[PDB]
Subunit: 131 residues, 3 copies
C-alpha cells in the first residue's frame, strides 16, 4: 500500500523550546517494508491555536529518525490577540527512504513561550513513489 496515514483529534497542551513529537502523528516506514524510493509527506494541522504573551505561534516540523527535514510556523499579528484564532497549517516535504529513513513524525515547538493547542482533527500522510 503506497498510502500511509496517522491522525489525532487532540494532544496534551505543552510548551517547548525544542521540537517535540506531536503524539500520534507517526508513520512506521520500516514496519511497512519500505526501504527505497521517495515519500511525499504532508503534515496537516488545520485548526491549531497558540496561547502566549508575546506574538504567539507554533513551529511545526516533519522529522525522521535522521531529524527535521522541513519546518515552518504560523504567528499572530498582535502581541496578545483579542482571541487566539484558528490558524490552518500544512507542511509538505519529499524524502529519500534509501538514505536510511525508518519512521516519519510530526513535531512542534513554541514561538516565544506559547502553549500549543490541537483539540480537533490533525493528520500526517505519506505517498510512496519508486522508480
Amino acid at each position: 500500500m503506497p498510502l500511509l496515514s496517522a491522525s489525532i483529534v487532540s494532544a496534551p497542551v505543552v510548551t517547548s523550546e525544542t521540537y517535540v513529537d506531536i503524539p500520534g502523528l507517526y508513520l512506521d516506514v520500516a514496519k511497512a517494508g519500505i526501504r527505497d524510493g521517495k515519500l511525499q509527506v504532508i503534515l496537516n494541522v488545520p485548526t491549531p491555536y497558540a496561547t502566549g504573551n508575546n506574538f504567539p505561534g507554533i513551529y511545526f516540523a516533519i522529522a525522521t529518525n535522521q531529524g527535521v527535514v522541513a519546518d515552518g510556523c504560523f504567528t499572530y499579528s498582535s502581541k496578545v490577540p483579542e482571541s487566539t484564532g484558528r490558524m490552518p497549517f500544512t507542511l509538505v516535504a519529499t524524502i529519500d527512504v534509501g538514505s536510511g529513513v525508518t519512521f516519519v513524525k510530526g513535531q512542534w515547538k513554541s514561538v516565544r513561550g506559547s502553549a500549543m493547542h490541537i483539540d480537533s482533527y490533525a493528520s500526517l500522510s505519506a505517498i510512496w513513489g519508486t522508480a
Copy 2:
C-alpha cells in the same frame, strides 16, 4: 487514472449551522470503478474569507456518502476584523474505499453565523492507492 480532481472559482455566499456541500467540490469514486484500497484526499481552499459580527470563521470538512471523515476551521483573532483577510485553508484525510465509499465532497459550516466566501480557485483532489 489514480489522480482525481474537481475545482471551482466561486460559490453562492451562504450561512449554515450545519455542514453543507460546497458546490462543485465533488469526486465520483464509484463512477471511476474504484471499489477498494485507499484515497488520500486534499481539500484546498486557499483564499476564503468569512463575514460576521462575532470572531468570524469557516469550518470545512471532507465528507463521503458515510458523512464527515475530517474537518477543521480558520477563525479571525478580532471580534469584527478591520478587514476580513484571506485565510488559506487545507485539509488532508485518508479513507478506506473498501468500507463502501462512492463519492467524496468538500463541505462548509459557519462559525458564529458567518457568511462564507469563495470567490477564486478552490480544489478537491484525491490519489488512489492499492496494496
Copy 3:
C-alpha cells in the same frame, strides 16, 4: 519516479504587480520524460509574510509553460499589522501533461504593493498519475 520535488529556504525580497517566478520552485517535467497523464502539484509556502502599508498580503500561483493553472492569496486583517505574522499557504492543482506541459513552477505577486518574504523552507511537489 512518480514523485517530483523542489525546495528553497529563502528568496530575494521583491515587490511585483505581476506573477513572477519564486526562484528554485521549479519542476522540469519534460526532462523527466513525462509526456502524458496527470500531475497533482502542491505549492507549500508554510511561513511567508508580507510587508506593506495597505492590508498587506501575497498572491501565489502554480504555473506551467502555458501560464497560471491555479492561484490564491493570504492577506492580513489590519491596514498595517502590529507585526506581519507568518501566514501558512498551500495551493493544490491537477494538470493534464498531455496538453503540452514541460515545466511547473511556483510564482508570486504583491497584494497592494507588499514586499514578499520567504526566509525558511518552502516546497513545490508533484505526483505523476497515468491511466
